[PDB]
């Protein structure tokens, strides 16, 4: 489906391209296979991200990367990429709203859930090498607000920064007051306790 | 502003990094000295450090004042991502 | 894996005076059973068995056609 | 600093700025206009091949090591003998 | 300096010596196509090579959300205030921390360095 | 590698006619001596005339012969002696530009 | 030595199932491109880059000899896993390797040369960019350059071999039972014990 949409969206193919019209065009790779070139990378990326957020043609699992300096667009449908969900910040305000929060907190007898949150374009899956073209904010109500301007172009936001810890390190209380070897030792000894 | 002048025997990056690390080490040591000299005569950290039982003034400093700089392979934290340490920072940020 | 990969692996396999030719068409998978009868995981643990399901395939035999189902 | 200079290896690349290979058979009409006066002075008071090897030495590195163009020329003469020709400008 | 190609076989033209008219000729090894060049310099090697990246900086970097932005450096051409900036972004650079600027106004793409 | 010196000297043998002999004269000191490599009376008189022109422009032929004979004694071969005389002519030219005697 | 010192750097390619290295222009010619202009169109996208052109020039100076697809294929196939005693078989082996084992992900059909040439040119172009100090070298520890084999991929890779062995065994049994010409059976030809 990604290849079909690329063909529909005016992407010149390699065998139909003169070797002179490639210097100013951004190459397109799909699963590491060079499939063509395009001349409007910004609009192409906007359309692809919109389609992935609507969950219409491109599954939420697919990642899209634009290397602005090197003029390359890379799209991966591969299996084995590791990704985590992130909130979406449009201008400076989260797309997550109090209506979403209420519909979530009435989750029982309402059939509204995480899939219905994802389908609304509120959250998104970001793999590791798509994280290199994103600007993250650790806390919404602290980093989106007006300050002495550090960054005013945030592109995502963290759900909660404590979700960076594994199963065995999520049981340590106040791990930010500890020492890293001590946290590692507790992660080791949590698999030996008797209960 | 290119106004920094290199030190003989060092590159521009080397002299910039040396100045930054020196400033930060001075800050950490000064805060440590303040934390030490602000202790009390009943403090148990002081009891276990002065007598030589277990601990050190650097441990007291890290508990009270400042943990300090983190280094990897002897250098500051490297640029794991494309020209930045984490996705939460702008590109080319050399702040503390 | 069960939904797609085994089917793709079966399909991509090349088919193997009178002549004989074979071509595997599609697969099937029943729920796990025990042959001496569904086998529950706890029974599989207790009796030192293996919790597994049988994989069938349609194979067609031709001579130069005859269909064999659920092989 | 003098001993520091004496004890540190240095080839021509450490001091050269740029180099090029030209085709200039005319001793007088030189493709490069900069060398004109002194190359004419050299040639006026005397075969050869028409090709050239023109190199340019970086001034900062030339003056840092307290080197001299006469020293470079005599080193070239020692290294290659008189089968080369060398003509050099001054600072 | 550059590479020039024969019009018959489309191969690289090597320099060949004309020992009659004291002239430089570019000739290929596939056919007998000759030429006369205007560079008059076979080979050039600069070892400093402190190339100014303003030739190599693309104007499309202004759409990067991960780059810092400032409003104290107006664009020279269109007078736009906001202007992205970054460092050399070059390997094999012995020492450099100079900033580079790109105007963020669409279709301006002015790339300077104060 | 040391193979370079073998390659280089081969290519210079392939660069034969005999080397031209010295011929004796001249106002220059010791000008009948063939001992300076690649030297000739015409090269010595050309260097002496260059030194005389520089000294006369700054202002006598004795000083010109002294500068030529000193430089021909100190230089390794006559081609370098002439280049060093032209260098001393350029230094006298900087003295005249500075107005110095 | 003098010739190596003047050449400097050359670009070579290590094709799979081939005894030793091959210069890149040889492979490009074996793909069916003869003109240096066309090969440089495939490699150097913007010809206003004299440093890139000078960097690629010593690689093209190895094309002074080889000029045709047939001889290029011969040169490539000379170094197979088992070198042939003939020449047509060697050339066929060279074509087979360039069509089956070099860049399988681009394509394996008959008309895949026009895209294999572009991808190989991209590999060479990225190598030139790395050598010129215009892009950062990759690091193996970056986690965007990694994949994770879970149960799906692991068991699928495991199952491919077992299905191949089952096909081999049924083939052997069929041939043995058919050389007699009597008859042939299916259930008796399949060893489920293999997979299980
Ligand atoms: Zn030609
Ligand atoms: Zn502007």
Curated annotation (Swiss-Prot), chain B:
Coiled coil: none
Post-translational modification: The tandem heptapeptide repeats in the C-terminal domain (CTD) can be highly phosphorylated. The phosphorylation activates Pol II. Phosphorylation occurs mainly at residues 'Ser-2' and 'Ser-5' of the heptapeptide repeat and is mediated, at least, by CDK7 and CDK9. POLR2A associated with DNA is specifically phosphorylated at 'Ser-5' of the CTD by CDK7, promoting transcription initiation by triggering dissociation from DNA. Phosphorylated at 'Ser-2', Ser-5' and 'Ser-7' of the CTD by CDK9 (P-TEFb complex), promoting transcription elongation.
Subcellular localization, as worded in the UniProt entry: Nucleus; Cytoplasm; Chromosome
Domain of life (superkingdom): Eukaryota
Domains as described in the record: The C-terminal domain (CTD) serves as a platform for assembly of factors that regulate transcription initiation, elongation, termination and mRNA processing.
Family: Belongs to the RNA polymerase beta' chain family.
Protein name: DNA-directed RNA polymerase II subunit RPB1
Organism for this UniProt entry: Bos taurus (Bovine)
Upper taxonomic lineage: Eukaryota, Metazoa, Chordata, Craniata, Vertebrata
Curated annotation (Swiss-Prot), chain E:
Zinc finger (TFIIS-type) boundaries: 71-113
Binding partners and assembly: Component of the RNA polymerase II (Pol II) core complex consisting of 12 subunits: a ten-subunit catalytic core composed of POLR2A/RPB1, POLR2B/RPB2, POLR2C/RPB3, POLR2I/RPB9, POLR2J/RPB11, POLR2E/RPABC1, POLR2F/RPABC2, POLR2H/RPABC3, POLR2K/RPABC4 and POLR2L/RPABC5 and a mobile stalk composed of two subunits POLR2D/RPB4 and POLR2G/RPB7, protruding from the core and functioning primarily in transcription initiation. Part of Pol II(G) complex, in which Pol II core associates with an additional subunit POLR2M; unlike conventional Pol II, Pol II(G) functions as a transcriptional repressor.
Zinc finger (C4-type): 6-31
Role summary: DNA-dependent RNA polymerase catalyzes the transcription of DNA into RNA using the four ribonucleoside triphosphates as substrates. Component of RNA polymerase II which synthesizes mRNA precursors and many functional non-coding RNAs. Pol II is the central component of the basal RNA polymerase II transcription machinery. It is composed of mobile elements that move relative to each other. POLR2I/RPB9 is part of the upper jaw surrounding the central large cleft and thought to grab the incoming DNA template.
Pfam families: Zn_ribbon_RPB9, Zn_ribbon_TFIIS
Gene this chain is encoded by: POLR2I
CDD domains to which the protein is assigned, alphabetical: Zn-ribbon_RPB9 (cd10508)
Domain of life, source organism: Eukaryota
GO CC field: nucleolus; nucleus; RNA polymerase II, core complex
Sites where the protein binds Zn(2+) 1: 6, 9, 28, 31
Coiled-coil zones: none
Swiss-Prot record, chain F:
Tissue and organ expression note: Ubiquitous.
Region (Interaction with POLR2A): 1-101
Regions annotated as coiled coil: none
Outcome when changing residue 15 to E: Abolishes interaction with POLR2A
Entry comment, domain topic: The alpha-helix immediately C-terminal to the Zn(2+)-binding site (residues 438-453, characterized in C-terminally truncated contructs) is required for helicase activity, is positively charged, and may play a role in DNA-binding and choice of substrates.
General function of this protein: DNA helicase that plays an important role in DNA replication, transcription and repair. Probably unwinds DNA in a 3'-5' direction. Binds to the RNA polymerase II subunit POLR2A during transcription elongation and suppresses transcription-associated genomic instability. Also associates with POLR1A and enforces the stability of ribosomal DNA arrays. Plays an important role in mitotic chromosome separation after cross-over events and cell cycle progress.
Family: Belongs to the helicase family. RecQ subfamily.
Known partners and oligomeric status: Monomer. Interacts with TOP2A, TOP3A and TOP3B. Isoform beta interacts with RNA polymerase II subunit POLR2A. Identified in a complex with the RNA polymerase II core bound to DNA. Interacts (via C-terminus) with POLR1A. Isoform beta interacts with RAD51. Interacts with WRN; this interaction stimulates WRN helicase activity on DNA fork duplexes. Interacts with MUS1; this interaction promotes MUS81-dependent mitotic DNA synthesis.
From Swiss-Prot, chain G:
Parts of the chain that traverse the membrane: none
Amino acids binding DNA promoter: 164
Subcellular location: Nucleus
Subunit structure: Component of the RNA polymerase II (Pol II) core complex consisting of 12 subunits: a ten-subunit catalytic core composed of POLR2A/RPB1, POLR2B/RPB2, POLR2C/RPB3, POLR2I/RPB9, POLR2J/RPB11, POLR2E/RPABC1, POLR2F/RPABC2, POLR2H/RPABC3, POLR2K/RPABC4 and POLR2L/RPABC5 and a mobile stalk composed of two subunits POLR2D/RPB4 and POLR2G/RPB7, protruding from the core and functioning primarily in transcription initiation. Part of Pol II(G) complex, in which Pol II core associates with an additional subunit POLR2M; unlike conventional Pol II, Pol II(G) functions as a transcriptional repressor.
Family as reported in the entry's similarity comment: Belongs to the RNA polymerase beta chain family.
Protein name, as recorded: DNA-directed RNA polymerase II subunit RPB2
Organism of derivation: Bos taurus
Primary gene name: POLR2B
């Amino acid at each position: 489906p990604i290849l079909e949409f690329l063909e529909e969206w005016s992407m010149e193919n390699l065998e139909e391209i003169s070797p002179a019209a490639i210097a100013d065009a951004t190459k397109i790779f799909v699963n590491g296979c060079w499939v063509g070139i395009h001349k409007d990378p910004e609009q192409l990326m906007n359309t692809l991200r919109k389609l992935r957020r609507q969950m219409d043609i491109i599954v939420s699992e697919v990642s899209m990367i634009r290397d602005i300096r090197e003029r390359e667009i890379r799209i991966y449908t591969d299996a084995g990429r590791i990704c985590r969900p992130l909130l979406i910040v449009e201008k400076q305000k989260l797309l997550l709203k109090k209506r979403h929060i209420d519909q979530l907190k009435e989750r029982e007898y309402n059939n509204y859930s995480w899939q219905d949150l994802v389908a609304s374009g509120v959250v998104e899956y970001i793999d590791t090498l798509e994280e290199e073209t994103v600007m993250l904010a650790m806390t919404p109500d602290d980093l989106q607000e007006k300050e002495v301007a550090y960054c005013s172009t945030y592109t995502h936001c963290e759900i909660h920064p404590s979700m960076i810890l594994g199963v065995c390190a999520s049981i340590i209380p106040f791990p930010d007051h500890n020492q890293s070897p001590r946290n590692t030792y507790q992660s080791a000894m949590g698999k030996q306790a008797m209960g | 502003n290119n106004e920094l002048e290199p030190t003989p025997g060092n590159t521009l990056r080397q002299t910039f990094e040396n100045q930054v690390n020196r400033i930060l080490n001075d800050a950490r040591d000064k805060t440590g000295s303040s934390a030490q000299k602000s202790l009390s005569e009943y403090n148990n950290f002081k009891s276990m450090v002065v007598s030589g039982a277990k601990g050190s003034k650097i441990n007291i400093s890290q508990v009270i004042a400042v943990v300090g700089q983190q280094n990897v392979e002897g250098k500051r934290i490297p640029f794991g991502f494309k020209h930045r340490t984490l996705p939460h920072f702008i590109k080319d940020d050399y702040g503390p | 894996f069960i939904q797609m990969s085994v089917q793709r692996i079966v399909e991509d396999a090349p088919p193997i005076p009178p002549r004989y030719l074979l071509k595997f068409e599609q697969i099937y998978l029943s729920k796990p059973t025990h042959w001496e009868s569904p086998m529950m995981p706890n029974e599989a643990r207790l009796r030192n068995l293996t919790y597994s399901a049988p994989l069938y395939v349609d194979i067609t035999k031709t001579v130069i056609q005859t269909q064999h189902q659920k092989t | 600093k003098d001993i520091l200079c004496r004890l540190e290896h240095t080839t021509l690349r450490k001091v050269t700025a740029n180099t090029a290979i030209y085709y200039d058979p005319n001793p007088q009409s030189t493709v490069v206009a900069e060398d004109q006066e002194w190359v004419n002075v050299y040639y006026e008071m005397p075969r050869i091949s028409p090709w050239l090897l023109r190199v340019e030495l970086d001034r900062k590195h030339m003056t840092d090591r307290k080197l001299t163009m006469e020293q470079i020329a005599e080193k070239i003469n020692a290294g290659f003998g008189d089968d080369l020709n060398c003509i050099f400008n001054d600072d | 300096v550059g590479i020039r190609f024969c019009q018959e076989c489309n191969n690289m033209l090597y320099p060949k010596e004309d020992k009659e008219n004291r002239i430089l000729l570019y000739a290929c090894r596939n056919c007998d196509y000759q030429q006369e060049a205007d560079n008059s310099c076979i080979y050039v090697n600069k070892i400093t090579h402190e190339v100014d990246e303003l030739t190599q900086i693309i104007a499309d970097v202004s759409q990067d959300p991960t780059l810092p932005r400032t409003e104290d450096h107006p664009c020279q051409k269109c007078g736009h205030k906001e202007a992205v900036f970054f460092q050399s972004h070059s390997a094999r650079a012995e020492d450099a921390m100079r900033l580079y600027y790109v105007c963020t106004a669409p279709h301006c793409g002015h790339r300077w360095t104060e | 590698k040391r193979e370079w010196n073998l390659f280089y000297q081969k290519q210079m043998q392939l660069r034969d006619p005999k080397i031209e002999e010295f011929v004796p004269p001249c106002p220059l000191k010791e000008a009948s001596s063939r001992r300076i490599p690649r030297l000739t009376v015409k090269a010595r008189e050309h260097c002496l005339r260059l030194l005389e022109e520089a000294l006369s422009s700054n202002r006598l032929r004795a000083k010109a012969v002294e500068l030529e004979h000193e430089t021909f004694r100190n230089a390794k071969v006559a081609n370098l002696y002439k280049a060093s005389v032209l260098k001393k002519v350029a230094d006298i030219h900087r003295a005249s530009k500075d107005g110095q005697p | 030595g003098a010739k190596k010192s003047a050449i400097g750097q050359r670009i070579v390619a290590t094709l799979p199932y081939i005894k030793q290295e091959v210069p890149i222009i040889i492979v490009f010619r074996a793909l069916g491109f003869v003109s240096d202009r066309d090969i440089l169109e495939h490699i150097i996208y913007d010809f206003e880059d004299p440093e890139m052109m000078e960097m690629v020039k010593p690689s093209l100076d190895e094309a002074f000899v080889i000029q045709e697809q047939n001889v290029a294929l011969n040169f490539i196939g000379s170094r197979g896993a088992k070198p042939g005693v003939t020449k047509e078989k060697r050339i066929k082996y060279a074509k087979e390797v360039l069509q089956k084992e070099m860049l399988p992900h681009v394509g394996v059909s008959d008309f895949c040369e026009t895209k294999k040439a572009y991808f190989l040119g991209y590999m060479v172009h990225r190598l030139l960019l790395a050598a010129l100090g215009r892009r950062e070298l990759d690091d193996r520890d970056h986690y965007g350059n990694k994949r994770l084999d879970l149960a799906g991929p692991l068991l699928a890779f495991l199952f491919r071999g077992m299905f191949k062995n089952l096909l081999k065994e049924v083939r052997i049994y069929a041939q043995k039972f058919i050389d007699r010409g009597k008859d042939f059976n299916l259930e008796l030809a399949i060893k489920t014990r293999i997979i299980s």
